[PDB]
Amino acid sequence: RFLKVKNWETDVVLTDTLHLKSTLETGCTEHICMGSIMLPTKDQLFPLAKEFLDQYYSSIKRFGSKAHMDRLEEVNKEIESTSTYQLKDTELIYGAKHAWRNASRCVGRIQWSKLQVFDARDCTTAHGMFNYICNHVKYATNKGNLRSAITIFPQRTDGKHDFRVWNSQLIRYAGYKQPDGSTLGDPANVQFTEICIQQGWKAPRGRFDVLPLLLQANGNDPELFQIPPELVLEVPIRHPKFDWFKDLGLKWYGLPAVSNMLLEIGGLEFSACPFSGWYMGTEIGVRDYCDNSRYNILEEVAKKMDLDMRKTSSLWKDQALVEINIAVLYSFQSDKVTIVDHHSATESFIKHMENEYRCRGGCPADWVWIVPPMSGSITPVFHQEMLNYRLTPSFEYQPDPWNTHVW
Amino acid sequence: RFLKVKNWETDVVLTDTLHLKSTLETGCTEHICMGSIMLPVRTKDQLFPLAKEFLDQYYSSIKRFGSKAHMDRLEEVNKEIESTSTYQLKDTELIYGAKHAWRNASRCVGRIQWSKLQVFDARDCTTAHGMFNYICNHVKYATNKGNLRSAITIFPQRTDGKHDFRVWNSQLIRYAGYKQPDGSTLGDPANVQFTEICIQQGWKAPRGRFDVLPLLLQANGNDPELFQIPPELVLEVPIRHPKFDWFKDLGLKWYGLPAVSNMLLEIGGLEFSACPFSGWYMGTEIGVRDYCDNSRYNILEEVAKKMDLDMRKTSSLWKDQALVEINIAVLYSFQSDKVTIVDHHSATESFIKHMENEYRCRGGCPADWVWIVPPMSGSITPVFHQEMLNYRLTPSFEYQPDPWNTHVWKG
Ligand code: HEM
Ligand code: HEM
Ligand SMILES: Cc1cc(N)nc(C[C@@H]2CNC[C@@H]2OCCN[C@H](C)Cc2cccc(F)c2)c1
Ligand SMILES: Cc1cc(N)nc(C[C@@H]2CNC[C@@H]2OCCN[C@H](C)Cc2cccc(F)c2)c1
Ligand SMILES: C[C@H](O)[C@H](O)[C@H]1CNc2nc(N)[nH]c(=O)c2N1
Ligand SMILES: C[C@H](O)[C@H](O)[C@H]1CNc2nc(N)[nH]c(=O)c2N1
Ligand SMILES: [Zn+2]
Numbered sequence: 001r002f003l004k005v006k007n008w009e010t011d012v013v014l015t016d017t018l019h020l021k022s023t024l025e026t027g028c029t030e031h032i033c034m035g036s037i038m039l040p041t042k043d044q045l046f047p048l049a050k051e052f053l054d055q056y057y058s059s060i061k062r063f064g065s066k067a068h069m070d071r072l073e074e075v076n077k078e079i080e081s082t083s084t085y086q087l088k089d090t091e092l093i094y095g096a097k098h099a100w101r102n103a104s105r106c107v108g109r110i111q112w113s114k115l116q117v118f119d120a121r122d123c124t125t126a127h128g129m130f131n132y133i134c135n136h137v138k139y140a141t142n143k144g145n146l147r148s149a150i151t152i153f154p155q156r157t158d159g160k161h162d163f164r165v166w167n168s169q170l171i172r173y174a175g176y177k178q179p180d181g182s183t184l185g186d187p188a189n190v191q192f193t194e195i196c197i198q199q200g201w202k203a204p205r206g207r208f209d210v211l212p213l214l215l216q217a218n219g220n221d222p223e224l225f226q227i228p229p230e231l232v233l234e235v236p237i238r239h240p241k242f243d244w245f246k247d248l249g250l251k252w253y254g255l256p257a258v259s260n261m262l263l264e265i266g267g268l269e270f271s272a273c274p275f276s277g278w279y280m281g282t283e284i285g286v287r288d289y290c291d292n293s294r295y296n297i298l299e300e301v302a303k304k305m306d307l308d309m310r311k312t313s314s315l316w317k318d319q320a321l322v323e324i325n326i327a328v329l330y331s332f333q334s335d336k337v338t339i340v341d342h343h344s345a346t347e348s349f350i351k352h353m354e355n356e357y358r359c360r361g362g363c364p365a366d367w368v369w370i371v372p373p374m375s376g377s378i379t380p381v382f383h384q385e386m387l388n389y390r391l392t393p394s395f396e397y398q399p400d401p402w403n404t405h406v407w
Numbered sequence: 408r409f410l411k412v413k414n415w416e417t418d419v420v421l422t423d424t425l426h427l428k429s430t431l432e433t434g435c436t437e438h439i440c441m442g443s444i445m446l447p448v449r450t451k452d453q454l455f456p457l458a459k460e461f462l463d464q465y466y467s468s469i470k471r472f473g474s475k476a477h478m479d480r481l482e483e484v485n486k487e488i489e490s491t492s493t494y495q496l497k498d499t500e501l502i503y504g505a506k507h508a509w510r511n512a513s514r515c516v517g518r519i520q521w522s523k524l525q526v527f528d529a530r531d532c533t534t535a536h537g538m539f540n541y542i543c544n545h546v547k548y549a550t551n552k553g554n555l556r557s558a559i560t561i562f563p564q565r566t567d568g569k570h571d572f573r574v575w576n577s578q579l580i581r582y583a584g585y586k587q588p589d590g591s592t593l594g595d596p597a598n599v600q601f602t603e604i605c606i607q608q609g610w611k612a613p614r615g616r617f618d619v620l621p622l623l624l625q626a627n628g629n630d631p632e633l634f635q636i637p638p639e640l641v642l643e644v645p646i647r648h649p650k651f652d653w654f655k656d657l658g659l660k661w662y663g664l665p666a667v668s669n670m671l672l673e674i675g676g677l678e679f680s681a682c683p684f685s686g687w688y689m690g691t692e693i694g695v696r697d698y699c700d701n702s703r704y705n706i707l708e709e710v711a712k713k714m715d716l717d718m719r720k721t722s723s724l725w726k727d728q729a730l731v732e733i734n735i736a737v738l739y740s741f742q743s744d745k746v747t748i749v750d751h752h753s754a755t756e757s758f759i760k761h762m763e764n765e766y767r768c769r770g771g772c773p774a775d776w777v778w779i780v781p782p783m784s785g786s787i788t789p790v791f792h793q794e795m796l797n798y799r800l801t802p803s804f805e806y807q808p809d810p811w812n813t814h815v816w817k818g
Contacts, residue, residue, distance in 0.1 A: 028435030033797035035442030036776035312752035318731045343721035367443035377782030388440040
């Protein structure tokens with residue numbers, strides 16, 4: 001019932017007790033591990049609210065105090081009469097910070113307590129949503145000196161009036177299928193780009209076209225808005241040694257901003273809660289640029305490097321991979337846009353895990369996601385045992401609304 | 408029931424039914440995943456069912472399930488168990504069993520090869536000297552002058568657990584490690600404890616950076632004995648780089664034959680506590696782990712120094728750069744000397760084809776993603792993008808505790 005995790009590089013053993021507080025299910029059983037699988041009423045609501053408020057009052061060293069008991073009663077009364085309840089601002093901020101703290105797939109959680117929460121629960125329209133999101137984008141970007149932020153739209157009610165951002169991230173590039181049979185731009189965004197056009201968007205029809213926002217307020221049909229281009233900070237990619245690298249015509253955006261998740265706090269569900277931090281360089285250089293089903297640029301780069309592409313054992317892909325990632329980091333750094341390399345980020349996470357173990361009795365972590373997609377074992381996280389379990393408040397994946405919405 | 412796995416690169420979806428034959432536990436539960444934890448005498452009572460389940464699988468594989476030969480073998484084994492409290496495997500069942508423990512090894516990326524395995528039956532062995540001779544022959548056969556052949560040598564099974572055969576070495580061939588009084592390590596820091604034991608047992612240590620360790624062998628629960636593998640049987644590769652002429656002067660080499668000797672082979676409930684097996688290396692094991700782990704040879708700095716990389720900040724990716732060059736050198740060196748090796752691209756691509764085939768012909772292929780994904784360039788291999796299901800099938804290879812921790816010294 002008390003569990004040990006060992007770091008095999010340092011021999012340091014940590015004891016996890018925080019898992020016993022875990023409630024939700026992993027997908028694994030005693031017979032089968034699903035560690036590598038990507039997607040593994042008033043009666044229900046009060047236990048959830050109470051569990052949350054208890055941990056909140058505990059956190060402010062007021063557990064079992066009159067103010068604690070009184071807020072539990074107030075929330076109980078409100079659930080009983082209205083079928084739901086409203087979080088206090090203090091509770092919302094606390095909840096949002098803890099959802100991040102609990103995100104077992106996030107390597108950047110050393111930062112979890114520095115999160116600017118924008119309360120958008122008074123929002124009623126998609127134009128209103130657009131305004132809130134522009135303000136988030138501008139605040140978070142901060143002229144390249146990025147600041148972590150979340151904007152929280154109104155909570156789910158009957159489920160027929162959901163707020164949703166249809167984009168998977170606030171800022172992404174369009175993808176287009178060609179008569180050629182090839183894909184122009186980001187192949188990940190083909191379906192979404194089509195939905196945008198089908199709603200009226202006029203695609204510039206290039207390789208790096210920032211997508212419009214498709215915002216759904218109050219369960220209405222979603223509406224298109226272009227983010228002011230001056231608010232979208234992008235970085236041209238060049239290499240510190242390779243003159244020709246700029247000729248590839250590569251750029252990326254500075255602000256990673258996930259907009260498709262569901263924030264659960266005290267049993268309440270926030271279906272539109274875009275949040276943003278700053279990039280670890282491998283997400284762009286390894287995944288966005290080099291996944292075969294993404295921009296898939298390895299071949300092009302390897303050729304400009306004049307590497308021997310005849311055999312896999314020359315490690316031409318691996319050489320080109322490093323150079324691409326060097327460029328990404330150099331480019332952001334030169335343009336003073338916050339980025340973190342995978343060495344620095346994973347070192348920080350180990351330090352964070354140690355803090356969490358001593359101050360909280362553990363840190364839920366998903367090794368499969370935490371270990372970077374390149375150079376795994378030369379980062380300290382590769383050698384660190386991690387226990388994965390689900391705590392609330394939480395961010396959860398939710399299905400694309402276009403499958404769910406009725407027009 | 409059916410469980411689906413998806414490949415996020417191809418959208419190919421597979422369906423697992425094989426997991427229903429899994430009995431043993433993972434370490435995980437509905438509330439916790441222990442996917443990244445490295446380590447998450449039987450009664451007649453437990454033994455006959457284990458035997459029966461194995462014999463049922465063996466007879467099905469030969470298309471003789473329910474035959475008289477099947478039924479007679481069940482009765483024979485049953486009678487053997489009730490009378491002697493154990494039983495002996497037929498040679499055919501042993502071979503089948505060892506091949507299947509490999510097929511079932513969820514952490515092994517090389518399983519496309521599983522049905523090609525030379526099995527050396529060493530169940531008539533009685534002494535450490537005899538173990539030494541069997542292991543020499545395995546090494547020579549498997550090495551085959553650089554054209555490596557997969558092999559396993561199987562010593563007598565456990566009886567009362569007081570008479571175990573054990574190879575004390577974790578691999579048949581490994582280099583010594585020596586802690587210096589100033590706290591530095593000479594040779595392989597992973598082998599310091601075992602080297603100290605060897606020296607205590609009477610080994611005269613050369614005290615260099617790549618001293619092949621002697622074998623320490625335990626027969627029939629007796630105190631283990633030291634033997635030096637004839638050096639002419641130990642194939643080694645000096646590591647050089649195709650473009651970098653200074654790489655040779657780092658003085659690196661490695662041995663050609665990876666031969667795991669510390670695992671326990673379970674077949675039909677019988678336990679083979681000494682079952683050394685070997686195949687050939689995937690390059691990254693040497694170039695990434697053995698050379699570049701901080702707790703192993705740890706060569707990254709010196710390599711990057713010699714490459715004149717900017718080492719003042721991690722974001723130059725100097726470590727990543729040196730890492731690729733080192734792994735180029737290992738592959739180049741093995742290939743140039745005609746010693747079998749496989750790169751991580753080829754091995755992972757072969758594993759995906761193996762896995763798809765296993766799903767089609769067998770109903771699944773248990774795989775441990777944490778181990779299958781190579782320790783460099785992860786997502787540029789197809790396994791990174793492949794969902795996997797991890798579960799335990801028997802026959803199996805299991806980790807066992809190091810024998811120096813458990814051994815009753817007779818003196
Ligand atoms: C401040 C800098 C941050 C860094 C460097 C960082 C790093 C990362 C990385 C590398 C991933 C894996 C992403 C992927 O491979 O798709 C991730 C996942 C995630 N992070 Fe962070 N993070 C940061 C901030 C944040 C913030 C501000 C939040 C929420 C408030 C957050 C919550 C999450 C969640 C929920 C996931 C899993 C996303 C999913 O399932 O797709 N992170 N983080
Ligand atoms: C034929 C060429 C082979 C290749 C390229 C190969 C590749 C590998 C690699 C890279 C690993 C992970 C090793 C590590 O990181 O420590 C591994 C693990 C393993 N393999 Fe293989 N393998 C091969 C043959 C074999 C054979 C012949 C057997 C047994 C008959 C075997 C059984 C195992 C087992 C039991 C593990 C897990 C070891 C442990 O838990 O320490 N493999 N394989
Ligand atoms: C099937 C599926 C499940 C799931 N939980 N997430 C995804 C999204 C998949 C998972 N990795 C690729 C894709 O996400 C891209 C989003 N990554 C962002 C930019 C991470 C990030 C980084 C820094 C700061 C942040 F705030 C957020 C897909
Ligand atoms: C705590 C622990 C548990 C466990 N199950 N194995 C280990 C052994 C750990 C796991 N990775 C580092 C150390 O293995 C070194 C052995 N690797 C061999 C060479 C694999 C191999 C490769 C090719 C062909 C083969 F037959 C065998 C440690
Ligand atoms: C199938 C496998 O789970 C999948 O490819 C995962 C592996 N690890 C990952 N890790 C991160 N950080 N992001 C990802 O998208 C993935 N994809
Ligand atoms: C903590 C973690 O489980 C451990 O470092 C694992 C990760 N993956 C691995 N994968 C392989 N092939 N070999 C290993 O030794 C390890 N070590
Ligand atoms: Zn699991």
